[PDB]
Amino acid sequence: REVSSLKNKLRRGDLPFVVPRRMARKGAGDGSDEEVDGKADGAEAKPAE
């Protein structure tokens, strides 16, 4: 039973294997025309003493 079990393991291929995984694709998507200006207001605080 021990020799038979060892022979069946080699014939079946029982080994510490890992299922492979595929690769992901890049998300290079086209942009939209929703542009915003970089304008900003100025400060109005007074200097300290």
Curated annotation (Swiss-Prot):
Post-translational modification (record): ISGylated.
Modified-residue entries (Phosphoserine), positions: S32
Residue numbers bearing the Omega-N-methylarginine modification: R12
Organs and tissues of expression: In the kidney, expressed in the glomeruli. Also expressed in leukocytes.
Location(s) in or outside the cell: Cytoplasm, Cytoskeleton; Cytoplasm, Cell cortex; Cytoplasmic vesicle, Secretory vesicle, Cortical granule; Cell membrane
Ranges of compositional bias, category Basic and acidic residues: 37-49
Protein origin, superkingdom: Eukaryota
Subunit: Myosin is a hexameric protein that consists of 2 heavy chain subunits (MHC), 2 alkali light chain subunits (MLC) and 2 regulatory light chain subunits (MLC-2). Interacts with RASIP1. Interacts with DDR1. Interacts with PDLIM2. Interacts with SVIL. Interacts with HTRA3. Interacts with Myo7a. Interacts with CFAP95. Interacts with LIMCH1; independently of the integration of MYH9 into the myosin complex. Interacts with RAB3A. Interacts with ZBED4. Interacts with S100A4; this interaction increases cell motility. (Microbial infection) Interacts with herpes simplex virus 1/HHV-1 envelope glycoprotein B.
Disease the record associates with this protein: Macrothrombocytopenia and granulocyte inclusions with or without nephritis or sensorineural hearing loss: An autosomal dominant disorder characterized by thrombocytopenia, giant platelets and Dohle body-like inclusions in peripheral blood leukocytes with variable ultrastructural appearance. Some affected individuals lack leukocyte inclusion bodies on classic staining of peripheral blood smears. Alport syndrome-like features of nephritis, hearing loss, and eye abnormalities are present in some patients. Deafness, autosomal dominant, 17: A form of deafness characterized by progressive high frequency hearing impairment and cochleosaccular degeneration.
Protein family (similarity comment): Belongs to the TRAFAC class myosin-kinesin ATPase superfamily. Myosin family.
Primary role: Cellular myosin that appears to play a role in cytokinesis, cell shape, and specialized functions such as secretion and capping. Required for cortical actin clearance prior to oocyte exocytosis. Promotes cell motility in conjunction with S100A4. During cell spreading, plays an important role in cytoskeleton reorganization, focal contact formation (in the margins but not the central part of spreading cells), and lamellipodial retraction; this function is mechanically antagonized by MYH10. (Microbial infection) Acts as a receptor for herpes simplex virus 1/HHV-1 envelope glycoprotein B.
Entry domain remark: The rodlike tail sequence is highly repetitive, showing cycles of a 28-residue repeat pattern composed of 4 heptapeptides, characteristic for alpha-helical coiled coils.
Protein's name according to its UniProt entry: Myosin-9
Gene that this sequence comes from: MYH9
Included stretch of the parent chain: 1912 to 1960 of 1960
